[PDB]
């Protein structure tokens, strides 16, 4: 079922949570998944994913604690001013990150997440949005998801699609070069923690 | 006061958590600060600094949840096991955790940490602890701090002290060219969490 918790802060109306809580399928509490969504009273859930790599996960959605968002136009300014190290050398973050959210968990409009189980999808989405949003070091995609491999007991097949599907999303000449590009109704949204102590979350949406 | 929780977990006796909680001096919840510890059953606190920067943050000494960690030797071996992204390439990684914990807070050698504050202090070496066990990215320190700046408030004097005093503690050179060198009885500790989802911790003592 979809929550429904209205906000008790001003300006920051957006009920943002992990959904990977009890009551999910196959939910387990050792299981270093995630499955961030936003939701305004009780209305359809965005998939979103997290910014700020040492600031708090938002938590569960059976915590009785709750994190409130501000929702923001997802342009280079609003990253600038809430991302604590992002990735602005290529100059087009916000088309980067764009370019991860129409090609990954659930979009997939090229068909790069093809094979990769849905939570094996987010957390490789998430990967690929945090080496732009957080400049989180990835070198060789090759030896990516070590720690995952150990704590999630992820099979060869479901390792392998994985590092592939990163090494072709933090690429933008592979991103590019591929059928289906992003389109101008396809928009990014930034998502600001009222608490600062919590991680800012991103969502993408057609309009 | 130092708290006294026994751990039920075989091998995991040692109590991690996060003293930065009600009852702090100056604590406020809106202060993105820190002051990790380890303790065994009510015993002498250790400072300690987390890694893994995508798994959750000790709880703070107040929660229901109490989160158990193993003591193993700080090699470079139980690093590359435990660590998602550690910056290994001058195979130097758990020399280099031990310098910083030798001059950072609250051991300070070579007085490093000078005029920083304790709570600036520990996240001036917990940035350092960072850049060497998830590999984050630090390109110039007189930009560092900029969120910390807003969101804790920091004055010029305690940002100029603390942005000298991180790129003193990543670089090697530096740290080996001070008059205190690191002795073989100031060893290494890495703290594995027995919870997967929860990050590792680290601490250094006089053996
Ligand atoms: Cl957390």
């Known amino acids: 079922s979809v929550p429904n918790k209205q ?4 300006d920051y109306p957006w009920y943002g949570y992990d959904s990977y809580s009890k009551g999910y399928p196959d939910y387990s509490p050792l299981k270093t998944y995630h499955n961030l969504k936003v ?27 709750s994190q409130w968002y501000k929702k923001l136009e997802g342009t280079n300014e609003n990253f600038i001013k809430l991302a604590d190290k992002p990735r602005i050398e290529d ?3 916000q088309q980067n990150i764009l370019r991860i959210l129409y090609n990954g968990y659930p979009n997939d409009r090229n068909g790069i997440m093809k094979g ?3 939570l094996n999808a987010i957390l490789v989405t998430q990967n690929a949005i945090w080496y732009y949003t ?5 070198s060789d995609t090759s030896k990516a998801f070590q720690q995952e491999e150990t704590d999630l007991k ?8 994985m590092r592939n599907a990163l090494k072709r999303l933090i690429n933008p000449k592979e991103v590019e ?31």
């Not at 957080?134 to 990835?138: F, M």
Request: aromatic share 12%; glycine share 2%.
């Open 177 to 207: 070069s591929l059928p289906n590009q992003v389109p101008a109704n396809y928009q990014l949204s930034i998502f600001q923690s009222s608490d600062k102590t919590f991680q800012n979350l991103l969502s993408a949406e057609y309009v």
């Open 39 to 65: 939701n305004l009273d009780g209305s359809k859930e965005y998939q979103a994913y997290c910014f700020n790599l040492t600031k708090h996960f938002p938590s569960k959605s059976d915590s009785v604690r």
């Open 154 to 161: 992820l099979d060869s097949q479901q390792l392998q699609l």
């Open 91 to 93: 100059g087009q973050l």
């Open 7 to 10: 906000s008790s802060v001003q």
């Open 134 to 138: 957080d400049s989180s070091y990835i």
């Open 116 to 118: 990769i189980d849905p």
